[PDB]
């Protein structure tokens, strides 16, 4: 599984003029592509990562407060070019990311996860396999990177 | 070097309340984050590739147009955070990073590569080394990461 974690602001999700579905202030937004060979442990070590990261300054010390400490949202967006690849080619290609059928059954699973580790209010969601447009504001930026094969 | 596109449709970058400094339509952002060891091949890989991928639809076809084809613009920022290290602890080790000096002069050689191979006018920096505000406006959300120590 990969994840790209961008700290923001706030974050405005929206849907085909477009109409707003999901919205966040300050927190994490976090682009979640998973991967043909997923167990449920690759999703595990990325939630508990997304939740438990310190990537807020305090008051005093750098890099020391998480999402959770500070009462702040997540936004759960589904990437499927994460994994949008490397060889010659400057088209991408999804085909080492999860069948998109398993792929939304895993999506869900997660993000009742997300909840049952933090706090449902906290976790925004996207409308999965969607065109959506989203509006971020990176404060920073500050951009994690994570990919759970390298474990 | 690893490096996180986006493709948007829009993108507003501001320091110190704020002050915008750089603002592109439609394009990409590039989070570019250089390693310690990088080489000058890395960054030419990481140049071809934002100026080269076909994130655009175009007509029938999907994945057609690259930022060149439909004279889109690049902004390009710095970003150690990439090589954030999570595997022991949940307090980032940027250890692996270039270090803000050197990796300054890199960046540069990186920009001037961007305006050799496209144009001036079509790559929008940030300020390096300084707090940073971006809105940028997600379109779709089209996100792509490469990282080239995967490569030879
Ligand atoms: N490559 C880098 N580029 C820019 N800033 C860095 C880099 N590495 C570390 N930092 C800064 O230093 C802090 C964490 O690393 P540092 O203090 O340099 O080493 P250590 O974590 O061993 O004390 C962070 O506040 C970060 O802003």
């Excluded at 991967?35 to 449920?40: E, I, S």
């Excluded at 070590?45 to 005093?60: E, S």
């Excluded at 500070?70 to 949008?84: A, C, H, M, P, R």
């Excluded at 504001?137 to 474990?151: A, E, L, Q």
Aim: glycine content about 6%.
């Amino acid at each position: 599984m990969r994840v790209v974690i961008q700290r923001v602001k706030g974050a405005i999700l929206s849907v085909r003029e477009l109409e707003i579905i999901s919205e966040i202030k300050n927190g994490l937004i976090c682009f979640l592509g998973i991967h043909k060979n997923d167990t449920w442990e690759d999703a595990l070590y990325i939630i508990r990562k997304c939740l438990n990261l310190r990537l807020w300054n305090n008051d005093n010390k750098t890099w020391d407060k998480n999402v959770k400490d500070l009462n702040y949202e997540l936004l759960i967006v589904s990437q499927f070019t994460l994994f949008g690849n490397t060889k010659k080619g400057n088209k991408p290609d999804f085909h080492l990311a999860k069948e998109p059928n398993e792929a939304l059954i895993f999506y869900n699973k997660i993000i009742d996860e997300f909840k049952k580790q933090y706090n449902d209010d906290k976790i925004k969601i996207g409308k999965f396999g969607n065109y959506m447009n989203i509006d971020v504001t990176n404060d920073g930026p500050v951009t994690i990177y994570i990919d759970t094969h390298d474990i």
